[PDB]
């Protein structure tokens, strides 16, 4: 009973997210243009969690030895595929080169995240890569906590941040989005394409096999799911208040 609130309340902010007023409030181009320049953050970040996830579920060093769970493992590495090495029609490209191809389309600048990630790639921390190229605070924080559960938190706590704070929320969120833009897909056709491209047993199973069945550690992965919707909710509420003081 103590994790039915989670699950209820996990439920409810998923409503939430799913119709947050940003995206009722992307009305033209320009609007558009800073909400990709925000958003591509999170595209970014994803992988963060997918590669925490295949490390932990997965077997990546020498020797190699079979994953405990297949049917986890089978997953991660389905997700793995499609998210670093999709097949578009333009080639081989991970979802995020796709994205900053959408921008590139659309006319948003992607100076400032190629020049994150490229400091990243230079070994700076991804806080120190944030500030350098002076990212919103909203986008810091998400970011920040994105990558404090990559490198901190316990795989079922990883888990919980990615089903129930990505997996499960981005085709409901990128919905409302498209349906808002699809009158403009003549103008912009890759972040169509983006978006219609990402539009729960096995996921409660690998939570209780990370979490070894305690219940305790099963409340970790839901306040996970929680805190990370938390975190969405925060950086579409900064990214709106922007459009608001900037309009
Ligand atoms: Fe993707
Ligand atoms: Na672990």
Same mark, same amino acid.
């Given at each position: 009973?103590?994790?039915?609130? +989670?699950?209820? %309340?996990? @439920? ?10 940003? *995206?009722? &409030? ?21 992988? &963060? ?68 990630? &490229?400091? /990243? ?9 944030? %500030? ?9 924080? *998400? ?9 901190? @938190? $316990?795989?079922?706590? /990883?888990? @919980?941040? *990615? ?22 897909? &003549? ?29 305790? %550690?099963?409340?970790?992965? +839901?306040?996970? @799911?929680?805190? $990370? ?19």
């Amino acid at each position: 009973n103590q994790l039915e609130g +989670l699950e209820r %309340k996990i @439920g409810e902010q998923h409503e939430r997210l799913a119709h947050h007023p940003v *995206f009722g &409030s992307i009305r033209t181009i320009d609007e558009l243009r800073v909400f990709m320049e925000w958003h591509v953050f999170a595209v970014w970040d994803f992988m &963060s969690l997918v590669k925490r996830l295949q490390q932990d579920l997965t077997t990546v060093a020498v020797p190699w030895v079979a994953p405990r769970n297949a049917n986890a493992s089978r997953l991660i590495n389905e997700i793995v595929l499609g998210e670093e090495s999709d097949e578009t029609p333009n080639g081989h490209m991970s979802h995020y080169d796709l994205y900053l191809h959408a921008m590139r389309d659309v006319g948003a600048s992607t100076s400032r995240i190629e020049e994150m990630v &490229s400091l /990243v790639r230079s070994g700076f921390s991804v806080s120190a890569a944030l %500030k350098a190229v002076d990212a919103p605070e909203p986008v810091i924080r *998400f970011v920040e906590a994105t990558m404090a559960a990559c490198t901190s @938190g $316990a795989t079922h706590q /990883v888990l @919980g941040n *990615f089903f129930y704070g990505r997996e499960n929320v981005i085709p409901d969120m990128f919905r409302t989005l498209l349906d808002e833009w699809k009158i403009e897909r &003549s103008s912009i056709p890759l972040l169509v394409y983006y978006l219609d491209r990402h539009i729960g047993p096995a996921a409660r199973a690998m939570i209780r096999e990370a979490a070894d069945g305690d219940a305790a %550690k099963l409340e970790e992965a +839901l306040q996970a @799911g929680l805190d $990370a919707i938390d975190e969405r909710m925060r950086l579409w509420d900064g990214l709106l208040a922007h459009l608001g003081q900037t309009r």
